Amino acid sequence: XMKXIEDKLXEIXSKXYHXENXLARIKXLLXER
Amino acid sequence: XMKXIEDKLXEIXSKXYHXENXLARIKXLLXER
Amino acid sequence: XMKXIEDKLXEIXSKXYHXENXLARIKXLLXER
Amino acid sequence: XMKXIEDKLXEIXSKXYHXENXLARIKXLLXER
């Protein structure tokens, strides 16, 4: 239930790291700080 | 309701695959492991 | 409250379109189907 | 609890800015409006 939802919201806030590592991919393609 | 929210959180954790396939796009542009 | 959360989960499932339009950016950089 | 979830959904709708700034990276690689 409640603590299912909050601990999926755990996973998403891992996928929004995997967002950071998107950018750090893009900043590879750019060599940008 | 509760089980609406948990099964949107189903969809998001599909969109955060569609994140994986972003990266696997970027790693196309880079030919990187 | 409940119907705050479900209608943020509205917004996210708009941001995960704005994911589609990431890819359709990347597929610009690639000219890929 | 409820107001934990709504204020993670705060963070996500920050990560879906950090989506905008993905695109504004991609539009760097493209020089596109």
Overall description:
4 copies of one chain form a homotetramer. The first copy, chain A, has helices spanning 4-7, 10-13. The first copy, chain A, is rod-shaped and about 45 Å long. Chain A is built from 2 helices and no strands. Chains in contact: A-B, A-D, B-C, C-D. The interface between A and D is medium-sized, with 17 and 17 residues.
C-alpha Rg of chain A, in Å?
14 Å
| Euclidean distance between termini CA atoms of chain A | 41 Å
- The helicity of chain A comes to 10-25%
How many runs of DSSP E, i.e. beta strands of chain A? 0
- Tell me about the largest β-sheet of chain A: none
Order of helices and strands of chain A: HH
Oligomer: homotetramer
Q: What fraction of residues of chain A sit in β-strands?
A: under 5%
* Biggest chain-to-chain interface with counts: A-B, 17 and 17 residues
Please give the count of helices of chain A.
2
- Please state the structural category of chain A: mainly alpha
Name the shape of chain A in a single word.
Answer: rod-shaped
Produce the secondary structure layout.
The structure is a homotetramer of 33-residue chains.
Chain A: H1 4-7, H2 10-13
